[PDB]
Amino acid sequence: EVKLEESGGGLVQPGGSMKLSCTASGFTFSDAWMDWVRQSPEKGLEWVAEIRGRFTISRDDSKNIVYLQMNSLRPEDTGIYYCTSPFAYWGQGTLVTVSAAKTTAPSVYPLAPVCGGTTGSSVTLGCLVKGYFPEPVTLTWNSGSLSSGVHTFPALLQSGLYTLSSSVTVTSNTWPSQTITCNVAHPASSTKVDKKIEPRDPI
Amino acid sequence: DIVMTQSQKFMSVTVGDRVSITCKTSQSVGTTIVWYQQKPGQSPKLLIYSASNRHTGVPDRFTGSGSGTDFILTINNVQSEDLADYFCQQYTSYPFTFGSGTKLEIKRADAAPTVSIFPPSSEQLTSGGASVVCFLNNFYPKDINVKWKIDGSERQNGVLNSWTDQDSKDSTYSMSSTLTLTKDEYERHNSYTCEATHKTSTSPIVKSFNRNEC
Ligand SMILES: [Zn+2]
Ligand SMILES: [Zn+2]
């Protein structure tokens, strides 16, 4: 069977360099076409040759290894880089993150409903997690006891820092009698925050 | 380089139906077309090559057709395990460019979004920031438009919209829209509005607040 396996990914700063490796087995290495394709939400699937100087493919003198040397990297080069022997054989993909951010803890803000009093049958609360790096953060409600009616939204890059939010919806006769708390944890900064959601008051 | 266009980014299907995914090449490529299937967290997987030649192990429900510039991947009797992104690719000219992708989704009855708006928290205002958040939850179909207004005028910059994946239980979508402002900007203007336009209503759904009110 054919096996391709990438390595050498991770974090790197803008203008920096990184060399990816891909070890191959199950065929005669020099008889095979070996290439690199990257995937991002913005650009989709791209052959490294489409990005063009900055991305150069080479091979090991003896071993079954193909390399991808990446230079002068930019934030837009962030994505998953696949080793491939076209068309059927692909590695697992390795994540390359290009960013100048230092490790930064999230600011966690509770989002209670409008002060006026939206009331109605149901009530929706929120929890805003802003300005953290790197990914990921884990967000739960009431130690994970409240899972129904929850929408945690994927993080987006805002400036050079990540921001995400989460909504939770419950019947109007629960909150604020039943306490509701979003629990946010960020392993990289060693921070675990619990923010209770409380009704707004006049300024 | 040759441009491969898949006009549909999302398609909704019912299990048992037939679906046709289109691919268009910017140049004549004969029948040098490959189709891939990609599930989340996995590499693309080869389905068809030479436009219509099915790869080993692929169910015969998958059929590729077309020649020249217009190609079609047809999935007959669609099953739940066919939910995935589908990509076309040409190999008449290197780089062997990929299409933009088409995700298969579940069809359901139309459902209006539940909209709720949230002014900046007290604690954020003390830290010197001001974000206005709008949740639009549990709607179908996916197509939706959100407009932010400040004292009646539309506001375009500083807006980030984040979609959830389709829900595995009720097949709906949810969206988060965040208007980021400076504190001094938030404290100058009065009215803040979140307007949602969706096919379930002729009129847009409007949620708003005034900064000084309660
Ligand atoms: Zn060969
Ligand atoms: Zn061949």
Short mmCIF file of C-alpha atoms and ligand atoms in Angstrom, two decimals:
data_model
loop_
_atom_site.label_atom_id
_atom_site.label_comp_id
_atom_site.label_asym_id
_atom_site.label_seq_id
_atom_site.Cartn_x
_atom_site.Cartn_y
_atom_site.Cartn_z
CA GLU A 1 0.00 0.00 0.00
CA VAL A 2 1.00 3.61 -0.64
CA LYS A 3 1.70 5.80 2.41
CA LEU A 4 2.55 9.52 2.31
CA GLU A 5 3.18 11.40 5.57
CA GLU A 6 4.00 15.09 5.98
CA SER A 7 5.92 16.76 8.81
CA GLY A 8 7.57 20.07 9.73
CA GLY A 9 4.48 22.29 9.98
CA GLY A 10 3.55 24.70 12.79
CA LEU A 11 3.89 28.39 13.64
CA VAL A 12 6.23 30.76 11.78
CA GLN A 13 6.56 34.57 11.66
CA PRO A 14 6.00 36.79 8.58
CA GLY A 15 9.12 36.94 6.39
CA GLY A 16 10.30 33.67 7.97
CA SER A 17 11.13 30.30 6.45
CA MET A 18 9.89 26.73 6.90
CA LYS A 19 10.78 23.41 5.28
CA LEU A 20 8.16 20.66 5.02
CA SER A 21 9.03 16.98 4.55
CA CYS A 22 7.00 14.10 3.20
CA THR A 23 8.10 10.49 3.63
CA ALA A 24 6.77 8.00 1.08
CA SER A 25 6.45 4.22 0.92
CA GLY A 26 4.85 1.51 -1.23
CA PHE A 27 6.45 2.36 -4.58
CA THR A 28 9.74 3.25 -6.25
CA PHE A 29 10.13 6.89 -5.22
CA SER A 30 12.01 8.14 -8.30
CA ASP A 31 9.43 6.59 -10.67
CA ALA A 32 6.70 8.80 -9.17
CA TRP A 33 5.48 12.34 -9.67
CA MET A 34 5.65 14.06 -6.26
CA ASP A 35 4.08 17.47 -5.72
CA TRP A 36 2.54 19.82 -3.16
CA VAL A 37 -0.98 21.27 -2.96
CA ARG A 38 -2.27 23.67 -0.31
CA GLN A 39 -5.82 24.32 0.88
CA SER A 40 -7.30 27.38 2.58
CA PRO A 41 -10.87 28.68 2.98
CA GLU A 42 -9.96 31.81 0.99
CA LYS A 43 -8.08 30.35 -2.01
CA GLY A 44 -9.36 26.74 -2.01
CA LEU A 45 -7.05 24.08 -3.48
CA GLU A 46 -3.84 25.44 -5.03
CA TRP A 47 -0.78 23.75 -6.48
CA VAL A 48 2.30 25.37 -4.90
CA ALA A 49 3.32 26.40 -8.46
CA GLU A 50 0.20 28.62 -8.71
CA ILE A 51 1.33 30.80 -5.78
CA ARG A 52 4.30 32.31 -7.69
CA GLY A 53 10.66 31.82 -5.96
CA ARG A 54 8.99 31.53 -2.55
CA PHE A 55 7.97 27.85 -2.84
CA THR A 56 10.58 25.35 -4.05
CA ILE A 57 10.28 21.57 -4.32
CA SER A 58 13.31 19.31 -3.85
CA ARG A 59 14.08 15.67 -2.98
CA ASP A 60 16.49 13.87 -0.66
CA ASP A 61 19.75 12.53 -2.16
CA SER A 62 18.90 8.93 -1.21
CA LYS A 63 15.77 8.60 0.99
CA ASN A 64 12.10 8.49 -0.07
CA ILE A 65 11.57 12.12 0.97
CA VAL A 66 10.24 15.12 -0.95
CA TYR A 67 10.66 18.60 0.54
CA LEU A 68 8.89 21.94 0.27
CA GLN A 69 11.06 24.94 1.13
CA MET A 70 8.90 27.98 1.90
CA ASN A 71 10.49 31.45 2.16
CA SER A 72 9.35 35.03 2.85
CA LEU A 73 6.02 33.78 4.20
CA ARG A 74 2.97 36.02 4.62
CA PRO A 75 -0.25 35.63 6.67
CA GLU A 76 -2.10 34.70 3.45
CA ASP A 77 0.13 31.59 3.13
CA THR A 78 -1.60 30.15 6.21
CA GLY A 79 -3.33 26.84 5.42
CA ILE A 80 -3.02 23.07 5.09
CA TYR A 81 -0.20 21.78 2.89
CA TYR A 82 -0.64 18.38 1.26
CA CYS A 83 2.05 16.12 -0.14
CA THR A 84 0.71 14.23 -3.16
CA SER A 85 1.55 11.73 -5.88
CA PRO A 86 -1.17 12.71 -8.34
CA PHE A 87 -3.94 12.01 -8.69
CA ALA A 88 -5.01 9.38 -6.15
CA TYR A 89 -2.38 9.57 -3.39
CA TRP A 90 -2.42 12.27 -0.71
CA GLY A 91 -0.86 12.72 2.72
CA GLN A 92 -2.82 13.75 5.81
CA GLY A 93 -1.88 17.42 5.35
CA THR A 94 0.10 19.62 7.74
CA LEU A 95 -1.02 23.01 9.06
CA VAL A 96 1.22 26.02 8.47
CA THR A 97 0.33 29.17 10.43
CA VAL A 98 2.04 32.42 9.46
CA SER A 99 1.62 35.06 12.18
CA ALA A 100 3.55 37.65 14.16
CA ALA A 101 1.30 37.34 17.23
CA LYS A 102 2.63 36.59 20.70
CA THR A 103 0.66 34.34 22.98
CA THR A 104 -2.29 36.44 24.13
CA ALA A 105 -5.05 35.49 26.56
CA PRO A 106 -8.68 36.10 25.54
CA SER A 107 -10.87 38.87 26.89
CA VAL A 108 -14.22 37.26 27.77
CA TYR A 109 -17.34 39.44 27.80
CA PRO A 110 -20.90 38.43 28.78
CA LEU A 111 -23.72 39.40 26.41
CA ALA A 112 -27.01 39.90 28.24
CA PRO A 113 -30.17 40.91 26.31
CA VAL A 114 -31.08 44.51 25.44
CA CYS A 115 -31.79 46.58 28.59
CA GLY A 116 -35.30 47.48 27.36
CA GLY A 117 -36.44 43.87 27.82
CA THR A 118 -36.89 41.79 24.67
CA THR A 119 -38.75 39.13 26.75
CA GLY A 120 -40.88 36.80 24.55
CA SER A 121 -41.23 33.02 24.84
CA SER A 122 -37.48 32.42 24.67
CA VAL A 123 -34.42 34.47 25.62
CA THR A 124 -31.01 34.41 23.93
CA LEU A 125 -27.74 35.12 25.76
CA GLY A 126 -24.19 35.42 24.40
CA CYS A 127 -20.51 35.15 25.30
CA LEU A 128 -17.87 37.09 23.34
CA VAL A 129 -14.27 35.83 23.33
CA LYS A 130 -11.97 38.46 21.83
CA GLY A 131 -8.30 38.99 21.05
CA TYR A 132 -6.62 35.64 21.69
CA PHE A 133 -3.74 33.75 20.10
CA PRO A 134 -3.05 31.05 19.26
CA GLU A 135 -6.00 28.78 18.53
CA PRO A 136 -7.77 27.02 20.07
CA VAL A 137 -10.13 27.99 22.88
CA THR A 138 -12.84 25.76 24.38
CA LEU A 139 -16.20 27.30 25.29
CA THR A 140 -18.95 25.62 27.32
CA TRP A 141 -22.00 26.71 29.33
CA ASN A 142 -22.39 25.78 33.02
CA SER A 143 -19.52 23.26 32.98
CA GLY A 144 -21.07 21.59 29.90
CA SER A 145 -24.42 20.95 31.66
CA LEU A 146 -26.23 23.23 29.19
CA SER A 147 -25.65 21.81 25.68
CA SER A 148 -29.08 22.23 24.02
CA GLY A 149 -29.89 25.41 22.08
CA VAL A 150 -26.21 26.38 21.82
CA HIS A 151 -24.40 27.83 18.81
CA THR A 152 -20.64 28.31 19.14
CA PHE A 153 -19.37 30.11 16.04
CA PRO A 154 -15.99 29.44 14.37
CA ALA A 155 -13.18 31.86 15.21
CA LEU A 156 -12.13 34.53 12.72
CA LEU A 157 -8.91 36.52 12.53
CA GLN A 158 -9.49 40.17 13.49
CA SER A 159 -6.30 42.23 13.21
CA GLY A 160 -3.69 39.55 14.17
CA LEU A 161 -5.83 37.99 16.91
CA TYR A 162 -8.71 35.51 16.97
CA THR A 163 -12.26 36.33 18.03
CA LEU A 164 -15.29 34.07 18.47
CA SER A 165 -18.72 34.23 20.05
CA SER A 166 -21.32 31.77 21.33
CA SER A 167 -25.08 32.04 21.77
CA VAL A 168 -27.34 30.05 24.08
CA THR A 169 -31.15 30.06 23.99
CA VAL A 170 -33.50 29.02 26.81
CA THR A 171 -37.11 29.48 27.95
CA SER A 172 -37.94 32.90 29.42
CA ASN A 173 -38.91 31.38 32.79
CA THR A 174 -35.38 30.02 33.48
CA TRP A 175 -32.97 32.99 33.25
CA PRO A 176 -32.17 34.95 35.30
CA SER A 177 -33.41 32.68 38.15
CA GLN A 178 -31.31 29.80 36.87
CA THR A 179 -27.70 30.98 36.73
CA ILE A 180 -25.99 30.88 33.30
CA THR A 181 -22.22 31.07 32.90
CA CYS A 182 -19.97 30.69 29.86
CA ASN A 183 -16.74 28.85 30.68
CA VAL A 184 -13.82 29.79 28.45
CA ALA A 185 -10.42 28.07 28.54
CA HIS A 186 -7.27 28.93 26.59
CA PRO A 187 -4.54 26.26 27.05
CA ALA A 188 -1.71 28.33 25.49
CA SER A 189 -2.01 31.17 28.04
CA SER A 190 -3.03 28.90 30.95
CA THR A 191 -6.24 30.87 31.51
CA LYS A 192 -9.63 29.48 32.55
CA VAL A 193 -12.36 32.10 32.90
CA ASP A 194 -15.97 31.79 34.06
CA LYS A 195 -18.23 34.76 33.26
CA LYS A 196 -21.74 34.81 34.73
CA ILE A 197 -24.38 36.39 32.49
CA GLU A 198 -26.33 39.04 34.41
CA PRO A 199 -29.12 41.42 33.33
CA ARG A 200 -28.14 44.88 32.08
CA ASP A 201 -28.97 47.99 34.13
CA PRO A 202 -29.26 51.70 33.17
CA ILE A 203 -26.03 53.71 32.70
CA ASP B 1 -3.69 29.14 -16.08
CA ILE B 2 -7.05 27.50 -16.81
CA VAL B 3 -9.86 28.63 -14.50
CA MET B 4 -12.26 25.96 -13.25
CA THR B 5 -15.62 27.34 -12.10
CA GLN B 6 -18.21 25.55 -10.02
CA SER B 7 -21.07 28.06 -9.91
CA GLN B 8 -22.81 26.36 -6.98
CA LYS B 9 -21.04 26.66 -3.63
CA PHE B 10 -23.86 24.88 -1.78
CA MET B 11 -26.54 22.43 -2.93
CA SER B 12 -29.36 21.01 -0.86
CA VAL B 13 -30.50 17.45 -1.52
CA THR B 14 -32.92 14.86 -0.19
CA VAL B 15 -31.77 11.27 0.35
CA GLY B 16 -32.86 9.22 -2.68
CA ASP B 17 -32.86 12.14 -5.13
CA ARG B 18 -30.61 12.75 -8.13
CA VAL B 19 -28.20 15.72 -8.04
CA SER B 20 -26.05 17.29 -10.76
CA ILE B 21 -22.91 19.28 -9.87
CA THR B 22 -21.60 21.51 -12.67
CA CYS B 23 -18.03 22.39 -13.57
CA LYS B 24 -16.95 24.83 -16.28
CA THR B 25 -13.42 25.20 -17.68
CA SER B 26 -12.21 28.49 -19.20
CA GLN B 27 -10.54 26.58 -22.05
CA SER B 28 -11.32 23.48 -24.14
CA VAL B 29 -9.94 20.50 -22.18
CA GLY B 30 -11.49 17.56 -24.06
CA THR B 31 -12.31 15.02 -21.35
CA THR B 32 -9.26 15.54 -19.09
CA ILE B 33 -11.34 16.05 -15.95
CA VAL B 34 -10.99 14.62 -12.45
CA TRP B 35 -13.61 14.72 -9.68
CA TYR B 36 -12.78 14.53 -5.96
CA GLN B 37 -14.84 14.03 -2.80
CA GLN B 38 -13.63 15.60 0.46
CA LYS B 39 -15.06 14.97 3.93
CA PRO B 40 -14.17 17.35 6.81
CA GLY B 41 -10.66 16.82 8.26
CA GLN B 42 -9.61 14.55 5.38
CA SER B 43 -7.67 14.94 2.15
CA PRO B 44 -9.59 14.88 -1.13
CA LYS B 45 -10.41 11.39 -2.44
CA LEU B 46 -10.43 10.50 -6.15
CA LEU B 47 -13.84 9.61 -7.64
CA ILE B 48 -13.54 9.88 -11.42
CA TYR B 49 -10.84 10.55 -14.02
CA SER B 50 -10.93 11.25 -17.77
CA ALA B 51 -14.33 12.94 -17.20
CA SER B 52 -16.32 9.67 -16.97
CA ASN B 53 -13.98 6.84 -15.85
CA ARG B 54 -14.93 5.81 -12.32
CA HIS B 55 -12.07 5.05 -9.89
CA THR B 56 -11.87 1.60 -8.25
CA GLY B 57 -14.16 1.16 -5.22
CA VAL B 58 -16.41 4.13 -6.05
CA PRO B 59 -20.16 3.28 -6.15
CA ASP B 60 -21.78 3.31 -9.61
CA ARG B 61 -24.25 5.96 -8.34
CA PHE B 62 -21.50 8.48 -9.20
CA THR B 63 -21.41 9.36 -12.91
CA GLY B 64 -19.18 11.90 -14.69
CA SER B 65 -20.05 13.38 -18.08
CA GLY B 66 -19.43 16.20 -20.54
CA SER B 67 -16.69 17.26 -22.92
CA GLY B 68 -15.05 20.52 -23.99
CA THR B 69 -15.74 23.15 -21.34
CA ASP B 70 -18.91 21.99 -19.50
CA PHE B 71 -18.83 18.97 -17.20
CA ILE B 72 -21.24 17.37 -14.77
CA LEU B 73 -20.89 15.08 -11.78
CA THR B 74 -24.18 13.27 -11.26
CA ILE B 75 -24.96 11.43 -8.04
CA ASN B 76 -27.95 9.12 -8.38
CA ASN B 77 -29.94 7.96 -5.35
CA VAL B 78 -27.98 10.26 -3.04
CA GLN B 79 -27.17 8.81 0.42
CA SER B 80 -26.28 10.51 3.72
CA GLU B 81 -22.63 9.42 3.36
CA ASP B 82 -22.43 11.46 0.11
CA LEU B 83 -22.52 14.71 2.13
CA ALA B 84 -19.14 16.30 1.38
CA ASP B 85 -17.38 18.89 -0.75
CA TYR B 86 -16.94 17.98 -4.42
CA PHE B 87 -14.15 19.43 -6.59
CA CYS B 88 -13.46 19.18 -10.32
CA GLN B 89 -9.97 19.45 -11.84
CA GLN B 90 -8.44 19.77 -15.31
CA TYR B 91 -5.17 18.20 -16.49
CA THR B 92 -4.88 19.54 -20.04
CA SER B 93 -2.42 22.18 -18.78
CA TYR B 94 -0.21 22.36 -15.66
CA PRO B 95 -0.86 23.65 -13.08
CA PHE B 96 -3.74 21.16 -12.95
CA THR B 97 -6.13 23.70 -11.47
CA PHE B 98 -9.01 22.73 -9.14
CA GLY B 99 -12.58 24.02 -9.12
CA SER B 100 -13.81 26.16 -6.21
CA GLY B 101 -15.89 23.33 -4.70
CA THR B 102 -19.54 22.43 -4.12
CA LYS B 103 -20.81 21.27 -0.72
CA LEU B 104 -23.81 18.95 -0.55
CA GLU B 105 -26.33 19.91 2.19
CA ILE B 106 -29.74 18.66 3.41
CA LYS B 107 -32.94 20.16 2.06
CA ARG B 108 -35.65 21.13 4.54
CA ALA B 109 -38.70 23.39 4.89
CA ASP B 110 -38.03 27.13 5.01
CA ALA B 111 -37.41 28.62 8.47
CA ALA B 112 -37.05 32.25 9.53
CA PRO B 113 -34.03 33.37 11.57
CA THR B 114 -34.41 34.20 15.25
CA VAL B 115 -32.65 37.55 15.56
CA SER B 116 -31.27 39.03 18.77
CA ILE B 117 -29.01 42.07 19.18
CA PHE B 118 -26.47 42.73 21.93
CA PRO B 119 -24.89 46.08 22.87
CA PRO B 120 -21.32 46.21 24.20
CA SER B 121 -20.92 44.74 27.69
CA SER B 122 -20.11 47.03 30.62
CA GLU B 123 -16.77 45.28 31.08
CA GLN B 124 -15.76 45.81 27.42
CA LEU B 125 -16.61 49.53 27.64
CA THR B 126 -14.37 49.84 30.72
CA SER B 127 -11.50 48.17 28.78
CA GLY B 128 -11.90 50.80 26.01
CA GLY B 129 -13.62 48.75 23.29
CA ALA B 130 -17.13 48.46 21.85
CA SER B 131 -18.52 45.52 19.85
CA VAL B 132 -22.17 45.16 18.80
CA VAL B 133 -23.21 41.54 18.24
CA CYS B 134 -26.15 40.14 16.29
CA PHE B 135 -27.11 36.45 16.27
CA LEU B 136 -29.31 35.05 13.52
CA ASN B 137 -30.16 31.51 14.61
CA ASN B 138 -31.80 28.42 13.13
CA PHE B 139 -32.78 29.48 9.60
CA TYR B 140 -33.13 27.81 6.20
CA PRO B 141 -32.15 28.27 3.46
CA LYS B 142 -28.50 29.28 3.86
CA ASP B 143 -28.84 32.42 1.71
CA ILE B 144 -29.11 35.49 3.98
CA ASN B 145 -28.08 39.16 4.06
CA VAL B 146 -27.27 41.25 7.15
CA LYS B 147 -27.14 45.06 7.15
CA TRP B 148 -25.85 47.23 10.00
CA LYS B 149 -27.16 50.78 10.36
CA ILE B 150 -26.02 53.57 12.68
CA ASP B 151 -28.46 56.49 12.99
CA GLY B 152 -30.09 55.41 9.71
CA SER B 153 -26.93 55.12 7.59
CA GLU B 154 -25.54 51.77 6.45
CA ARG B 155 -22.21 50.70 7.98
CA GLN B 156 -20.00 48.31 6.01
CA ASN B 157 -16.47 48.33 7.48
CA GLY B 158 -15.75 46.58 10.79
CA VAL B 159 -18.30 43.82 10.12
CA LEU B 160 -17.48 40.11 10.45
CA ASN B 161 -20.04 37.41 9.64
CA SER B 162 -19.45 33.85 10.87
CA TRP B 163 -21.64 30.92 9.78
CA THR B 164 -22.07 27.60 11.55
CA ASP B 165 -22.06 24.36 9.58
CA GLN B 166 -25.53 22.93 8.92
CA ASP B 167 -27.02 21.39 12.08
CA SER B 168 -27.05 17.57 12.13
CA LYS B 169 -30.41 17.44 13.96
CA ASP B 170 -32.69 20.11 12.44
CA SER B 171 -30.68 20.92 9.26
CA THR B 172 -30.72 24.70 9.92
CA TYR B 173 -28.00 27.34 9.74
CA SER B 174 -27.01 30.02 12.25
CA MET B 175 -25.00 33.19 11.71
CA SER B 176 -23.12 35.66 13.92
CA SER B 177 -22.61 39.27 12.78
CA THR B 178 -20.25 41.48 14.80
CA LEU B 179 -19.83 45.23 14.34
CA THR B 180 -16.54 46.34 15.88
CA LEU B 181 -16.29 50.01 16.85
CA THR B 182 -14.06 52.23 18.96
CA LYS B 183 -15.52 53.34 22.30
CA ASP B 184 -15.61 57.02 21.31
CA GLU B 185 -17.50 56.09 18.13
CA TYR B 186 -20.03 53.92 19.98
CA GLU B 187 -20.64 56.66 22.56
CA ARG B 188 -21.25 59.37 19.93
CA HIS B 189 -24.00 57.73 17.86
CA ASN B 190 -27.44 56.79 19.22
CA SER B 191 -29.31 54.11 17.21
CA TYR B 192 -27.83 50.71 16.32
CA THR B 193 -29.71 48.34 14.01
CA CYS B 194 -29.31 44.78 12.72
CA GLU B 195 -31.38 44.12 9.55
CA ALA B 196 -31.76 40.57 8.20
CA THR B 197 -33.05 39.89 4.68
CA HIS B 198 -34.23 36.31 4.06
CA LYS B 199 -36.60 34.57 1.61
CA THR B 200 -39.07 33.73 4.44
CA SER B 201 -40.22 37.38 4.57
CA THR B 202 -40.81 40.20 2.07
CA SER B 203 -39.88 42.66 4.81
CA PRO B 204 -36.46 42.49 6.51
CA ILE B 205 -36.31 41.42 10.17
CA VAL B 206 -35.15 44.42 12.21
CA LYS B 207 -33.61 44.37 15.68
CA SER B 208 -32.27 47.58 17.19
CA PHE B 209 -31.54 49.50 20.37
CA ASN B 210 -30.67 53.01 21.50
CA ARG B 211 -27.48 53.42 23.54
CA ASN B 212 -28.96 55.70 26.24
CA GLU B 213 -32.20 53.70 26.69
CA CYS B 214 -33.27 50.81 28.91
ZN ZN C 1 6.31 6.87 -13.75
ZN ZN C 2 -2.51 8.13 -16.69
#
